[PDB]
Design a protein around this ligand. Sequence first.
Ligand SMILES: CC(C)(COP(=O)(O)OP(=O)(O)OC[C@H]1O[C@@H](n2cnc3c(N)ncnc32)[C@H](O)[C@@H]1OP(=O)(O)O)[C@@H](O)C(=O)NCCC(=O)NCCS
Ligand SMILES: C[C@@](O)(CCO)CC(=O)[O-]
Ligand SMILES: C[C@@](O)(CCO)CC(=O)[O-]
Lengths: 375, 376
Amino acid sequence: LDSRLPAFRNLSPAARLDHIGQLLGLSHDDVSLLANAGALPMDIANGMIENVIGTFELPYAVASNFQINGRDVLVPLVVEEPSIVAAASYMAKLARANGGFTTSSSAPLMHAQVQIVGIQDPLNARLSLLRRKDEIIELANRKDQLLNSLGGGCRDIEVHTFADTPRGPMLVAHLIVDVRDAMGANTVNTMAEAVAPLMEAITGGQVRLRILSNLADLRLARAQVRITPQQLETAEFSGEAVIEGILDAYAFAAVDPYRAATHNKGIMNGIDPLIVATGNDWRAVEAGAHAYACRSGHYGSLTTWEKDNNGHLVGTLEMPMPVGLVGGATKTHPLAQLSLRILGVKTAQALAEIAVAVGLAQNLGAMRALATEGI
Amino acid sequence: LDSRLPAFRNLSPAARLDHIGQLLGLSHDDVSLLANAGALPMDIANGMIENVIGTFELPYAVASNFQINGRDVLVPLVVEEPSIVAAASYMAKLARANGGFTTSSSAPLMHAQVQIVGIQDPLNARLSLLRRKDEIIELANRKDQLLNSLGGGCRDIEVHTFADTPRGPMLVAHLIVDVRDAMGANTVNTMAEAVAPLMEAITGGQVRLRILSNLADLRLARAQVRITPQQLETAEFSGEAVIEGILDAYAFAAVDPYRAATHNKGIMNGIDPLIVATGNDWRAVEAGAHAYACRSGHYGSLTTWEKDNNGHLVGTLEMPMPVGLVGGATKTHPLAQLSLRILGVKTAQALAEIAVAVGLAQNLGAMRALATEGIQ
Ligand SMILES: CC(C)(COP(=O)(O)OP(=O)(O)OC[C@H]1O[C@@H](n2cnc3c(N)ncnc32)[C@H](O)[C@@H]1OP(=O)(O)O)[C@@H](O)C(=O)NCCC(=O)NCCS
Ligand SMILES: C[C@@](O)(CCO)CC(=O)[O-]
Ligand SMILES: C[C@@](O)(CCO)CC(=O)[O-]
């Protein structure tokens, strides 16, 4: 597959669609889903949320030049803002010359929180739970036998305590669950809620909230990119000068939350559109991203930018990225299914890796422009 | 306008649409935009973003029973997740019995950052800028006569310094701009560019970036709600017990970032759909919300929940809310325009106030369920 779409930005929507169908070998029916308005039937729409009275459209585009771990990939994006798709495509083009984007990710692990509250001895109760963790882990898994046969399931449990709160001492158990190709919400909420009774028996307290945590710091995705000075040379500045300017911009975001917020927003300009295109939950992705950005106590930059021993500009992006290939709109929306088809992803983590590659490219594009704009 | 919409739940989409058109007196052309697929022409879509090859649909719904400062309002929402719209509508229903939602907001003030490097004297340069602030403020305003005549314009300037960074000392100036019924991006970025030269002359340093800040903490919107124990009573728990459970949930979110993130996510489940429906930038709203949530040095809850002297559950939501009635997709998308018509908002801040009322209702709905019989 060749993701380099020469003059793509100049072709009409119909010609672009036609092209894409050729390169990927899409069927007639497939192409029809995009060539005609209304791919989301009302009976499906009406079943997705409540009080439905119609549908709302947003442009559906494809970013070009992406390469992940040596393989070309086409990226669908749904958003209303200008310059996003173009910036992503351009930066991806420059990345190709140096190997493209290199990515990796952890197992798809999600947290399931179980809050406990009228315990006179929360600290002691915590060791009682840890003592019987295997028992708890087995109860959570037999709950769902199919997931375990697919390679997932509850892998462990952690317990934290907050003995000093205005409502008193609280004990919070975390089930660590491998959710496979799903986002994780229902799977995880379901186990938390099967284990609640046993935890009450062990601790003697009262279980309150049983719910997942959107701060998915155990489900990380990572991307790297490299750019040389020769590729950033403008008619006004040398490539070396531009790189120095980009490093200044990064340092600025690392120390000032007012810039970091804007800096990180640019990253989500690239990621959210891919989430929407695949029918995934963008509020979940946004919460995990920004909460992770301030885990140290200071709200900073999700990406990093440096200059290697060769003077080359190198950036990274590591962040929580919970997404699914199954569940909700990802399965019921005809276009969400087509997007996955166009992407060619076989696992949820593969989609997560593409997401951060796009976020990284978007961040780079924004800084390059901000740093090259004449006064 | 009566926003209760009886039986809306069981109506068909066509019947719901018809009913809405009646209440608001919408024209046939307007109803046609929703009764038919393709309200967004491809010539418009193709001009919105790059490399377009078609369009992507999401359900368009209307939340019922909302009431803002004594006036009923219908709320459009575009999202893919179930139970959002129903929860919002149900909580709005309970709020009506006690006066509905009460809201307020600050002026539409946005920050425009101007970063300066290349000077060994940042802390002196900062006073040089403050000394000539009126001059700077006048230069920024002459750049937008219309905005000022409409009641907006640069109102002041702030200057901050970061004398010690891995890249050397930095000076950062903030233009404080009233942008009225606009989100603010282009308006503020333009004034920043216009003032950059003068700032360089005054400080002797080199200007780098000139860009707005998405941490819009000077453009806040606020909402309040009140619920009585009688309204929260279930077959299993007493009203008073439920309220105590909700307070436990709030305390949990206030101390543990793992819960706060999820807690705040629920708030955005209510807000983002309204942003999409009005053609606004949802990444901007999300960034301002979460960054604001950790301004104290600890990522916490955007909302607050308490019990007043009467034992009634009272909640609040104050947060940055950048939105516009003009600019971008808000003007070019036929349905974004219809949404504003349905809402009846006359200013951007009025839309911002409705947004937080919805976010507050959503948060309440999620906690009531979690604390009571379950989320599931
Ligand atoms: C949706 C929910 C209310 C349904 O169960 P319920 O409490 O048994 O429902 P009720 O029949 O008592 O609901 C009554 C009111 O809720 C609203 N409601 C409930 N189900 C609804 C639906 N399918 N469509 C529209 N409104 C609905 C109605 O507006 C109604 O008022 P009305 O007189 O104007 O018609 C409940 O599951 C809930 O609140 N869940 C919380 C989950 C959450 O926070 N979800 C967010 C997405 S995570
Ligand atoms: C330009 C930018 O604001 C993107 C626009 O939404 C991001 C950034 O400043 O890095
Ligand atoms: C139910 C909730 O998880 C929303 C799901 O999308 C929010 C919350 O926990 O408050």
